[PDB]
């Protein structure tokens, strides 16, 4: 179906520890494929998926140039925003930026986005029509005026509907064996007595991709949200993800509960029982 | 407020020159373009945050200097006559892939000559109005002629009563080639017959030749000089 | 590469000047129109960053991005609009403007009562110094160019005092024949 490409930038000023740290990561769907860390030795954009290494040297030189210019842009903006908020340079502050584009099943542009934060709160965001900005506070309206004068929205839209979509399509094709393949969860259940009269049933889902998944407990065929515990989906480290859901049940009645697993890689939902 | 020094520059084949470009506007991107007859604005160099972003010059003799803030000087080594052109420095507030507009400096007109001995300032001649024009049109046209200068490094201006004027003036946009080692340029100033009939009014054509600086050696050196011709109004 | 047409354009005062610019680089996203007067530096006139049109005073820029085509329209053209008009393009992710070869626009002044005349002028600081002035002719009139060495005829030069007038200068033959038209 749909696919996305997304970049995440983080710039942190660090009084006493040198110039601001700048970290950039690129994702296609749930798969990281490039990174830049201003603290690393290479000073280069670096590959993080096999299929991005299909790109020639001009790609790596130009991306490295481009991402290091962005780090300088964040360095300037950190100083500019300090002045807007009247903050001293002896403090640490953080700019975060996320942007990207989605394509549909036909490979055609679906939507684009760009959101920026300062110190963990909304600063400025491109609106869904990609024609204007929503700034969140007074300082961000100063930014918004500058960006309107510089036609920043039209420039961002031109990337989002052009280069962004074109390179996403190329990445999806070069990475087809893994990016367009769905890995179904391997499931099992664990049982942990917590007292002489109660036990914990945990439903596991392991090795799945993409990261979207649904774990729901039932008792006697009826949905169970009471005394349940759902954990945040987590990376296994090899490109797949893991998740579990648990329920506390009366001891002796464990077999009256079922776990239900839904995933894009499953022809039909899975039902597990202890 | 982009600063380019100098405006005009003579150099000898095989020498090295620095073209100065500075801006104190807080701009984060600076660029170099080259203006010639066949390519009015040929891109050369693009810098953002003092870093080279892109380069389309096919000669290693051209090296920008970006280590100093506010500057992007252009060093050209082993100069050739083919390098003769007007070099334009530009800047933009934002980095080069996001700039909404580029502002251009005034340019450095570079002329590379085989032999510095051919440099000569112009002779400036003022031609006085025709009585017939004054009688028939009630207007008076003065024509200024600048001849025999080399290279084509001249600015021509008119001064009426010590105040430079631009109304009623037309100067040729480009100097004409009198010979292989000589140019000439012309201009005219038109005023009223009453204004020309007033002997208190003073009329002066000024040609500012740009030649050799003091660093260039010489065995009457053709230096940067204002050469003028003048005339006063007459009752008649 | 940036392709401009026409190479040169002559419009009358008050007329419409129409200029076109196309890019052969399919990656281009933004266009600029720059104007450079003779002896001056290029000055940005209009810029356009998406499909559509933008009107500023007597100037309208259009962009058709699918055809990589921009056009500049100058209505009610003024003699002061005479200049070199440079189109520039940039692709998303590129770091500079790339300029075309330009269109030289000449706007001819409107001369209501042309009274053509050819006068002789004298340099009082030098005998045998004489030049001819062709003045007050109509803007559609051709000034002859020279072919003999030692003889120079300048192109027509518009000066403004209204009272705009055309003029040309020749020096080295009598004055009436130097300004005669042939072909």
């Amino acid at each position: 179906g749909s696919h996305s490409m997304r970049y995440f930038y983080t710039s942190v000023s660090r009084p006493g520890r040198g110039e601001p740290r700048f970290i950039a990561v690129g994702y296609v769907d749930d798969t990281q494929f490039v990174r830049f860390d201003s603290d690393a030795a290479s000073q280069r954009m670096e590959p993080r998926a096999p299929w991005i290494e299909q790109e020639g040297p001009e790609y790596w030189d130009q991306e490295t140039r481009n991402v290091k210019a962005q780090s300088q842009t964040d360095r300037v903006d950190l100083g500019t925003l300090r002045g807007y908020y009247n903050q001293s340079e002896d403090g640490s502050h953080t700019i975060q930026i996320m942007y990207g584009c989605d394509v549909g099943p036909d490979g055609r542009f679906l939507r684009g986005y760009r959101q920026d934060a300062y110190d963990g709160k909304d600063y400025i965001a491109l609106n869904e029509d990609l024609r204007s900005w929503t700034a969140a506070d007074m300082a961000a309206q100063i930014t918004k005026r500058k960006w309107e004068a510089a036609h920043a929205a039209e420039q961002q839209r031109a990337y989002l509907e052009g280069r962004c979509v074109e390179w996403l399509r190329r990445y999806l094709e070069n990475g087809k064996e893994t990016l367009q393949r769905t890995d179904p969860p391997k499931t099992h259940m664990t049982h942990h007595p917590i007292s002489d009269h109660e036990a914990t049933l945990r439903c596991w889902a392991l090795g799945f991709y993409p990261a979207e998944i649904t774990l729901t407990w039932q008792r006697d065929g009826e949905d169970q949200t009471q005394d349940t515990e759902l954990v945040e989906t987590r990376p296994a480290g090899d490109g797949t993800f893991q998740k579990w859901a648990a329920v506390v049940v009366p001891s002796g009645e464990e077999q009256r509960y079922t776990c239900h697993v839904q995933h894009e890689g499953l022809p039909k939902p899975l039902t597990l029982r202890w | 407020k982009i600063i380019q020094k100098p405006k005009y520059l003579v150099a000898v084949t095989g020498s090295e020159k620095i073209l100065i470009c500075e801006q104190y506007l807080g701009h984060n991107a600076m660029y170099w373009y080259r203006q010639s007859a066949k390519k009015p604005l040929e891109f050369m160099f693009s810098y953002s945050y003092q870093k080279l972003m892109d380069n389309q010059t096919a000669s290693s003799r051209f090296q920008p200097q970006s280590s100093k803030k506010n500057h992007l000087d252009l060093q050209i080594t082993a100069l050739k006559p083919d390098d003769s052109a007007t070099y334009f420095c530009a800047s933009s507030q934002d980095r080069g892939d996001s700039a909404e507009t580029l502002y251009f400096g005034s340019g450095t007109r570079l002329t590379v000559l085989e032999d510095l001995r051919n440099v000569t300032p112009p002779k400036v001649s003022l031609f006085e109005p025709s009585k017939a024009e004054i009688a028939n049109k009630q207007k008076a046209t003065l024509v200024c002629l600048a001849r025999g200068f080399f290279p084509d490094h001249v600015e021509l201006s008119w001064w009426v009563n010590g105040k430079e004027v631009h109304s009623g003036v037309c100067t040729d946009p480009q100097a004409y080639k009198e010979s292989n080692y000589s140019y000439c340029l012309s201009s005219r100033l038109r005023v009223s017959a009453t204004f020309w009939h007033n002997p208190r009014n003073h009329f002066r054509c000024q040609v500012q030749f740009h030649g050799l600086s003091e660093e260039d050696k010489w065995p009457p050196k053709p230096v940067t000089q204002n050469i003028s011709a003048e005339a006063w109004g007459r009752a008649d | 590469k940036v392709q401009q047409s026409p190479e040169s354009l002559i419009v009358p005062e008050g007329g419409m000047a129409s200029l076109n610019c196309t890019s052969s680089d399919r990656n281009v996203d933004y266009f600029w129109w720059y104007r450079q007067h003779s002896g001056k530096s290029p000055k940005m006139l209009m810029s356009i960053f998406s499909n559509g049109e933008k009107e500023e005073g007597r100037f309208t820029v259009h962009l058709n991005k699918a055809s990589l085509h921009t056009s500049l329209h100058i209505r009610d053209s003024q003699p002061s609009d005479s200049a070199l008009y440079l189109c520039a393009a940039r692709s998303s992710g590129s770091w500079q403007l790339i300029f075309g070869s330009g269109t030289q626009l000449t706007v001819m002044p409107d001369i209501q009562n042309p009274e053509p005349a050819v006068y002789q002028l004298k340099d009082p600081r030098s005998q045998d110094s004489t030049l001819c002035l062709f003045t007050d002719f109509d803007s559609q009139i051709n000034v002859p160019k020279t072919m003999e060495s030692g003889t120079f005829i300048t192109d027509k030069c518009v000066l403004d005092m209204d009272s705009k007038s055309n003029g040309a200068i020749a020096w080295s033959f009598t004055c009436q024949d130097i300004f005669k038209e042939t072909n």
Binding site: V67, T80, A150, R163 | - | -
Partner: peptide, 9 residues
């Protein structure tokens, strides 16, 4: 490829 527009804030 990266493509955040970099007009200064």
């Amino acid at each position: 490829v990266v493509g955040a527009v970099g007009v200064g804030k």
